[PDB]
Amino acid sequence: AKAHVATLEGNYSDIVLGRVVAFGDTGWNFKEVDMTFIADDADADSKTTLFAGVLVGEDGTPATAAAGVFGVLVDRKVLPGVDHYIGVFEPGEKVPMVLAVRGLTLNQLKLKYADGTAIDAAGIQALEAQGNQVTDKIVGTQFIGSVL
Amino acid sequence: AKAHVATLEGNYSDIVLGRVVAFGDTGWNFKEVDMTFIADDADADSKTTLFAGVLVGEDGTPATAAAGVFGVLVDRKVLPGVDHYIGVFEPGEKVPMVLAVRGLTLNQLKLKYADGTAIDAAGIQALEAQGNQVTDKIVGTQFIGSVL
């Protein structure tokens, strides 16, 4: 019968590795857009297909091409482990979401197109123009079986 | 504007109202059958359509008419209120279940065909051959509202 198991292996700090803190307004780095949280046709109890770290344009549509990259979805409603919002939204509803745009250090690996596929060089160049530092310098971690 | 909600407004000891307990063996009334828990072609996390009170034949399949009735299903795993069999099975995977056939006092308002149709006259008559009482003498509860 297998087993009922759940796993959580990620945090918010692993996507936005750091900011530039403004003195005039702490919201200088974020923009708010309206997004289709639950697909139009999916049943009310279907979980949302959005996952933290996806690249979304300024019009709320996840990017399937490098050109339509405007920001990284970092809303607190789609972070790893937050599964409560099931059936809480009418299918086809559009709900505001928070995008991070300017003045950030962004992890290369967690950025992903609408369909999970990693981002190319064109995407990196397009996103950097907003003033973000996409980096590959992550130490990582090793577990259990890896001798040290 | 519709919030996450759940309900539990039914339980065991209503589909079956009382037994005749054999002194020699407490398990004379019941019987095991083998049925597919998760639909033969649905998703692993998708919930089963089985609910307590659904009539099944002697081969372990839900009934469709009066002739395909052998007993009721009162298994522990399907009692109204319990739902944590999330992907612990596979599509079409057989699982043992428990029926209720002999020496029982049953409730008409709860018995249902496979699709939920209220039990008909022929189904009642057939299920009485096993020696079970079928009654409508039920004092329904009047909830807050009208005056008592």
Short mmCIF file of C-alpha atoms in Angstrom, two decimals:
data_model
loop_
_atom_site.label_atom_id
_atom_site.label_comp_id
_atom_site.label_asym_id
_atom_site.label_seq_id
_atom_site.Cartn_x
_atom_site.Cartn_y
_atom_site.Cartn_z
CA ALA A 1 0.00 0.00 0.00
CA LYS A 2 3.00 2.35 -0.30
CA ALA A 3 2.63 5.04 2.37
CA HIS A 4 1.20 8.52 2.83
CA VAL A 5 4.26 10.78 2.79
CA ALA A 6 4.91 14.49 2.30
CA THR A 7 8.17 16.39 1.92
CA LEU A 8 9.37 19.99 2.26
CA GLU A 9 12.87 20.75 0.97
CA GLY A 10 12.94 24.48 0.20
CA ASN A 11 12.60 27.99 1.66
CA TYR A 12 11.94 31.57 0.59
CA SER A 13 15.52 32.72 1.21
CA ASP A 14 16.76 30.22 -1.40
CA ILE A 15 15.10 32.17 -4.24
CA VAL A 16 15.82 35.81 -3.35
CA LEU A 17 19.31 35.47 -1.89
CA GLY A 18 19.35 39.15 -0.88
CA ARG A 19 18.00 42.64 -1.58
CA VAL A 20 18.99 46.25 -1.73
CA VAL A 21 17.08 47.79 1.17
CA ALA A 22 15.60 51.18 0.37
CA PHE A 23 15.15 53.93 2.95
CA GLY A 24 12.25 55.69 1.24
CA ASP A 25 10.01 52.66 0.70
CA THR A 26 10.62 48.99 1.46
CA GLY A 27 8.32 48.11 -1.45
CA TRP A 28 10.65 49.54 -4.08
CA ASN A 29 11.65 46.02 -5.13
CA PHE A 30 8.17 44.54 -5.65
CA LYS A 31 5.30 44.99 -8.09
CA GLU A 32 1.73 43.71 -7.78
CA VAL A 33 -0.12 42.10 -10.69
CA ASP A 34 -3.33 40.10 -11.11
CA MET A 35 -2.95 36.39 -11.86
CA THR A 36 -5.26 33.47 -12.66
CA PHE A 37 -4.63 31.45 -9.52
CA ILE A 38 -6.64 28.34 -10.48
CA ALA A 39 -6.98 27.36 -14.13
CA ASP A 40 -10.31 28.29 -15.68
CA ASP A 41 -11.41 24.73 -16.47
CA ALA A 42 -9.94 22.89 -13.48
CA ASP A 43 -12.33 21.78 -10.76
CA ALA A 44 -12.69 23.88 -7.63
CA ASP A 45 -10.66 21.44 -5.50
CA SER A 46 -7.71 21.21 -7.90
CA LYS A 47 -4.53 22.67 -6.46
CA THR A 48 -3.07 25.69 -8.21
CA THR A 49 -0.50 25.03 -10.93
CA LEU A 50 1.63 28.04 -9.94
CA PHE A 51 4.85 27.28 -8.07
CA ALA A 52 7.23 29.74 -6.45
CA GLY A 53 10.10 30.83 -8.67
CA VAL A 54 8.22 30.83 -11.99
CA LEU A 55 8.92 33.73 -14.35
CA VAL A 56 5.84 35.83 -15.09
CA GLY A 57 5.29 38.85 -17.29
CA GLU A 58 3.88 42.17 -16.13
CA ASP A 59 0.39 41.08 -17.27
CA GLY A 60 0.12 38.05 -14.98
CA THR A 61 0.78 35.40 -17.64
CA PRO A 62 3.64 32.97 -16.91
CA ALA A 63 6.35 33.21 -19.55
CA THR A 64 6.80 30.36 -22.02
CA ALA A 65 9.44 32.42 -23.85
CA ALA A 66 12.48 34.40 -22.76
CA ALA A 67 11.04 37.69 -24.04
CA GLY A 68 8.04 37.73 -21.69
CA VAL A 69 10.18 37.68 -18.54
CA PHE A 70 9.40 40.58 -16.22
CA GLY A 71 9.63 39.24 -12.68
CA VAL A 72 9.87 36.22 -10.42
CA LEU A 73 6.76 35.12 -8.54
CA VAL A 74 7.59 35.20 -4.83
CA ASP A 75 4.08 35.48 -3.40
CA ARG A 76 3.57 34.06 0.07
CA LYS A 77 0.56 32.06 -1.17
CA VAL A 78 2.65 29.71 -3.34
CA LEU A 79 5.76 29.15 -1.24
CA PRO A 80 6.73 25.53 -0.57
CA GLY A 81 4.46 23.84 1.95
CA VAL A 82 1.50 26.24 1.75
CA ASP A 83 -1.20 23.91 0.41
CA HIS A 84 -4.17 25.25 2.39
CA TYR A 85 -5.73 27.28 -0.46
CA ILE A 86 -7.68 24.43 -2.05
CA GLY A 87 -11.18 25.32 -3.19
CA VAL A 88 -10.77 28.77 -1.66
CA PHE A 89 -10.89 30.43 -5.10
CA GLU A 90 -13.47 30.21 -7.84
CA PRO A 91 -11.97 28.58 -10.96
CA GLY A 92 -11.15 31.42 -13.34
CA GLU A 93 -10.72 33.94 -10.53
CA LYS A 94 -7.96 36.52 -10.85
CA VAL A 95 -6.19 37.30 -7.57
CA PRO A 96 -3.35 39.81 -6.97
CA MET A 97 0.17 38.44 -6.60
CA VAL A 98 3.51 39.97 -5.62
CA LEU A 99 6.40 39.98 -8.10
CA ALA A 100 10.03 40.82 -7.31
CA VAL A 101 11.56 43.01 -10.00
CA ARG A 102 14.42 45.29 -8.94
CA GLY A 103 17.50 45.18 -6.76
CA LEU A 104 17.79 41.47 -5.94
CA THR A 105 20.27 38.62 -5.99
CA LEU A 106 18.40 35.81 -7.72
CA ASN A 107 19.35 32.13 -7.70
CA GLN A 108 19.97 30.71 -11.18
CA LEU A 109 18.62 27.23 -10.52
CA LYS A 110 15.20 28.05 -9.04
CA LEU A 111 14.12 30.28 -11.93
CA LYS A 112 11.97 28.20 -14.26
CA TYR A 113 9.74 28.82 -17.25
CA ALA A 114 6.00 28.26 -17.08
CA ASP A 115 6.51 24.52 -17.67
CA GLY A 116 9.45 23.90 -15.32
CA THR A 117 12.09 24.15 -18.05
CA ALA A 118 15.14 26.06 -16.87
CA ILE A 119 15.96 29.51 -18.25
CA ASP A 120 18.34 30.19 -21.13
CA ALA A 121 20.90 32.94 -21.67
CA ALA A 122 18.28 35.13 -23.35
CA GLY A 123 16.15 34.94 -20.21
CA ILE A 124 19.11 35.85 -18.02
CA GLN A 125 19.91 38.89 -20.15
CA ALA A 126 16.26 39.96 -20.26
CA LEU A 127 15.81 39.71 -16.49
CA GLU A 128 19.14 41.32 -15.58
CA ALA A 129 18.05 44.50 -17.38
CA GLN A 130 15.65 45.15 -14.50
CA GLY A 131 18.69 45.30 -12.20
CA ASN A 132 19.05 41.81 -10.73
CA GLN A 133 22.15 39.67 -10.22
CA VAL A 134 21.55 36.13 -11.48
CA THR A 135 24.34 34.01 -9.98
CA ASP A 136 25.58 30.41 -10.03
CA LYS A 137 27.76 30.63 -6.90
CA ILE A 138 25.77 28.33 -4.59
CA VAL A 139 27.64 25.92 -2.33
CA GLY A 140 24.83 23.39 -1.99
CA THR A 141 24.65 20.59 0.56
CA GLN A 142 25.37 16.88 0.91
CA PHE A 143 23.33 14.32 2.84
CA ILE A 144 23.89 11.10 4.77
CA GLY A 145 25.76 8.92 2.30
CA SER A 146 28.29 11.44 0.98
CA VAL A 147 31.53 11.01 2.91
CA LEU A 148 33.19 14.19 4.17
CA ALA B 1 -15.79 34.94 -0.62
CA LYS B 2 -16.30 31.21 -0.05
CA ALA B 3 -14.01 29.91 2.69
CA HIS B 4 -12.47 26.50 3.27
CA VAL B 5 -15.00 24.33 5.12
CA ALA B 6 -15.62 20.71 6.06
CA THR B 7 -18.58 18.78 7.45
CA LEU B 8 -19.28 15.54 9.31
CA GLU B 9 -23.02 14.94 9.61
CA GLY B 10 -23.37 11.16 9.57
CA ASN B 11 -21.62 8.15 11.05
CA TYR B 12 -21.84 4.40 11.58
CA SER B 13 -24.62 2.92 13.74
CA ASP B 14 -27.08 4.57 11.35
CA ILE B 15 -26.65 2.52 8.18
CA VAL B 16 -26.91 -0.43 10.58
CA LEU B 17 -29.18 0.08 13.58
CA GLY B 18 -28.60 -3.18 15.47
CA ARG B 19 -27.54 -6.81 15.13
CA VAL B 20 -28.44 -10.22 16.37
CA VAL B 21 -25.16 -11.23 18.00
CA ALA B 22 -24.32 -14.91 17.73
CA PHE B 23 -22.93 -16.22 21.00
CA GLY B 24 -20.47 -18.56 19.32
CA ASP B 25 -18.89 -16.06 16.91
CA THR B 26 -19.27 -12.28 16.86
CA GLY B 27 -18.48 -12.28 13.13
CA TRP B 28 -21.38 -14.32 11.76
CA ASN B 29 -23.20 -11.38 10.16
CA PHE B 30 -20.41 -9.93 8.04
CA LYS B 31 -18.36 -11.07 5.04
CA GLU B 32 -15.34 -9.87 3.11
CA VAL B 33 -15.31 -8.92 -0.57
CA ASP B 34 -12.56 -7.58 -2.81
CA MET B 35 -13.19 -4.33 -4.68
CA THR B 36 -11.15 -1.64 -6.41
CA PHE B 37 -10.75 1.30 -4.03
CA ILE B 38 -9.40 3.93 -6.42
CA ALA B 39 -11.19 4.10 -9.77
CA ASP B 40 -9.61 1.85 -12.39
CA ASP B 41 -8.38 4.84 -14.43
CA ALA B 42 -8.42 7.93 -12.16
CA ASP B 43 -5.56 9.85 -10.55
CA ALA B 44 -3.71 8.43 -7.55
CA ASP B 45 -4.73 11.22 -5.18
CA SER B 46 -8.27 11.35 -6.59
CA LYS B 47 -10.78 10.21 -3.99
CA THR B 48 -12.84 7.06 -4.45
CA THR B 49 -16.54 7.29 -5.29
CA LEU B 50 -17.37 4.62 -2.71
CA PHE B 51 -19.48 5.68 0.26
CA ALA B 52 -20.97 3.70 3.13
CA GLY B 53 -24.38 2.27 2.30
CA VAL B 54 -23.64 1.46 -1.35
CA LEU B 55 -25.06 -1.93 -2.31
CA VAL B 56 -22.67 -4.51 -3.78
CA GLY B 57 -23.06 -7.95 -5.30
CA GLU B 58 -21.57 -11.22 -4.13
CA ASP B 59 -18.62 -10.70 -6.51
CA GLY B 60 -17.42 -7.51 -4.81
CA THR B 61 -18.75 -4.89 -7.23
CA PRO B 62 -21.26 -2.04 -6.75
CA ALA B 63 -24.83 -2.92 -7.69
CA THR B 64 -26.96 -1.44 -10.46
CA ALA B 65 -30.41 -3.06 -10.04
CA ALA B 66 -32.37 -5.22 -7.63
CA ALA B 67 -30.87 -8.48 -8.93
CA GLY B 68 -27.28 -7.41 -8.28
CA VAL B 69 -27.78 -6.87 -4.54
CA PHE B 70 -26.08 -9.10 -1.96
CA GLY B 71 -25.37 -6.83 1.01
CA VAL B 72 -24.35 -3.42 2.27
CA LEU B 73 -20.85 -1.96 2.68
CA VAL B 74 -19.97 -0.67 6.15
CA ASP B 75 -16.18 -0.87 5.96
CA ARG B 76 -14.08 1.13 8.41
CA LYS B 77 -12.15 2.87 5.61
CA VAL B 78 -15.31 4.40 4.09
CA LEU B 79 -17.14 5.66 7.18
CA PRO B 80 -18.34 9.26 6.66
CA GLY B 81 -15.66 11.48 8.17
CA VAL B 82 -12.46 9.54 7.45
CA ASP B 83 -10.33 10.74 4.54
CA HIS B 84 -6.59 10.07 4.68
CA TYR B 85 -6.30 7.37 2.01
CA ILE B 86 -4.51 9.83 -0.26
CA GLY B 87 -2.58 7.95 -2.92
CA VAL B 88 -1.95 5.01 -0.57
CA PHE B 89 -3.39 2.81 -3.33
CA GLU B 90 -3.12 2.47 -7.10
CA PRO B 91 -5.71 2.68 -9.90
CA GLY B 92 -7.48 -0.66 -10.12
CA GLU B 93 -5.69 -1.95 -7.02
CA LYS B 94 -7.79 -4.55 -5.23
CA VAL B 95 -8.39 -4.07 -1.51
CA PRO B 96 -10.33 -6.23 0.99
CA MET B 97 -13.55 -4.73 2.34
CA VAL B 98 -16.31 -5.65 4.79
CA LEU B 99 -20.01 -6.12 4.04
CA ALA B 100 -23.11 -6.67 6.18
CA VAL B 101 -25.51 -9.40 5.12
CA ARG B 102 -27.29 -11.37 7.84
CA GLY B 103 -29.26 -10.49 10.95
CA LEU B 104 -29.28 -6.70 10.64
CA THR B 105 -31.68 -3.79 11.09
CA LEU B 106 -31.01 -1.42 8.19
CA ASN B 107 -31.97 2.17 7.38
CA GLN B 108 -33.79 2.94 4.14
CA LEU B 109 -32.88 6.63 4.06
CA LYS B 110 -29.16 5.78 3.91
CA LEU B 111 -29.06 2.86 1.47
CA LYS B 112 -27.99 3.90 -2.02
CA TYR B 113 -27.34 2.22 -5.34
CA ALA B 114 -23.99 2.64 -7.07
CA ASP B 115 -24.91 6.02 -8.57
CA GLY B 116 -26.74 7.20 -5.44
CA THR B 117 -30.28 6.26 -6.47
CA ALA B 118 -32.50 5.57 -3.48
CA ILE B 119 -33.09 1.86 -2.99
CA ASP B 120 -36.19 0.70 -4.85
CA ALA B 121 -38.86 -1.84 -3.90
CA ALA B 122 -37.23 -4.76 -5.72
CA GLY B 123 -33.85 -4.06 -4.13
CA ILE B 124 -35.41 -3.97 -0.67
CA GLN B 125 -37.24 -7.23 -1.35
CA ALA B 126 -34.10 -8.96 -2.60
CA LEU B 127 -31.99 -7.80 0.34
CA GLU B 128 -34.64 -9.07 2.78
CA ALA B 129 -34.02 -12.62 1.54
CA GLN B 130 -30.77 -12.62 3.53
CA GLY B 131 -32.81 -11.95 6.67
CA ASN B 132 -32.44 -8.23 7.35
CA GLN B 133 -35.04 -5.76 8.57
CA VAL B 134 -35.57 -2.63 6.47
CA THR B 135 -37.36 0.17 8.30
CA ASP B 136 -38.54 3.74 7.80
CA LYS B 137 -39.55 4.18 11.47
CA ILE B 138 -36.95 6.88 12.08
CA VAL B 139 -37.36 9.98 14.27
CA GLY B 140 -35.57 12.58 12.20
CA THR B 141 -33.93 15.42 14.10
CA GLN B 142 -35.34 18.93 13.82
CA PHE B 143 -32.49 21.43 13.90
CA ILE B 144 -32.57 25.05 15.02
CA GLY B 145 -35.27 26.93 13.17
CA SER B 146 -38.89 25.87 13.55
CA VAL B 147 -40.26 25.98 17.08
CA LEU B 148 -40.56 23.03 19.42
#
